[PDB]
Amino acid sequence: NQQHEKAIKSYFDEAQTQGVIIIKKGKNISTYGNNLTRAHTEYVPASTFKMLNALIGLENHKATTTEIFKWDGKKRSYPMWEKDMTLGDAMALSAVPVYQELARRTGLDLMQKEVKRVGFGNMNIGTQVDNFWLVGPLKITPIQEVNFADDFANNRLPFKLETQEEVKKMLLIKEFNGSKIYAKSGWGMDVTPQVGWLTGWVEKSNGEKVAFSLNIEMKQGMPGSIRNEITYKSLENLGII
């Protein structure tokens, strides 16, 4: 344990920021990093919330996986997003306007009841249905995120199995020789300090799943790819990949 703890701490120190990565193997949770107090600190979920937004919208018949969300011509933050696309396309791009459209279909009352029912973070979505995961009031700790990811990996979230499978398919980001990474990034740019997330699980070819949640402070000039770099170095050190 001491050797893994020192090595994983060193990956955050090398990144010149403060962070944790939580690992869930079976019944056991482990916390690593260079500022362990982050593990029980609440942060906005940022785009990690897209996982739950998608589950809620599909379960309640507000969308399907083949539906095309049309661009309405309004200016978006990235020209790439100014196109028609599916929920899965938008998941991979973190295209917030598509997920705002979905959230508005669900509506405030149903969204709040669902977030409370799932027990996600502090469970408060407030009164602004289309930005609550970006700026608050909804906040969640890294340990809460890893437990969400662990449930999702094992089809234990309180949604139909088919709904969980549909959203899982939107989250494949990488494969290492038979080991697949299902994860969602987040970057809260409208809070201070900024928060970076990568939450998901490793799915091994034998069916085993290991959930993880990386949480870091994003610094000025720091690349988004640092989230993946720290995560993969940590998973490799632990022998998970």
- Report d(CA 215, CA 178) in Å as an integer: 26
The architecture CATH gives domain 1-241 = 3-Layer(aba) Sandwich (3.40)
Q: How was this structure determined?
A: X-ray
| Inter-residue contact 154 to 26 (CB < 8 Å) | no
Q: Before 45, cis peptide (omega within 30)?
A: no
- Report d(CA 37, CA 43) in Å as an integer: 12
| Inter-residue contact 42 to 141 (CB < 8 Å) | yes
| Inter-residue contact 213 to 121 (CB < 8 Å) | no
Strand partners, 42: none
47 is catalytic: yes
| Inter-residue contact 61 to 110 (CB < 8 Å) | no
- Report d(CA 227, CA 218) in Å as an integer: 9
| Inter-residue contact 11 to 236 (CB < 8 Å) | no
| Inter-residue contact 83 to 75 (CB < 8 Å) | no
| Inter-residue contact 200 to 214 (CB < 8 Å) | no
Neighbours of 174 (CB within 10 A): 15
- Report d(CA 185, CA 47) in Å as an integer: 6
- Report d(CA 137, CA 110) in Å as an integer: 17
- Report d(CA 231, CA 201) in Å as an integer: 11
- Report d(CA 157, CA 155) in Å as an integer: 6
- Report d(CA 129, CA 2) in Å as an integer: 44
Neighbours of 113 (CB within 10 A): 13
Q: Which of 30, 47, 185, 213 is catalytic?
A: 47
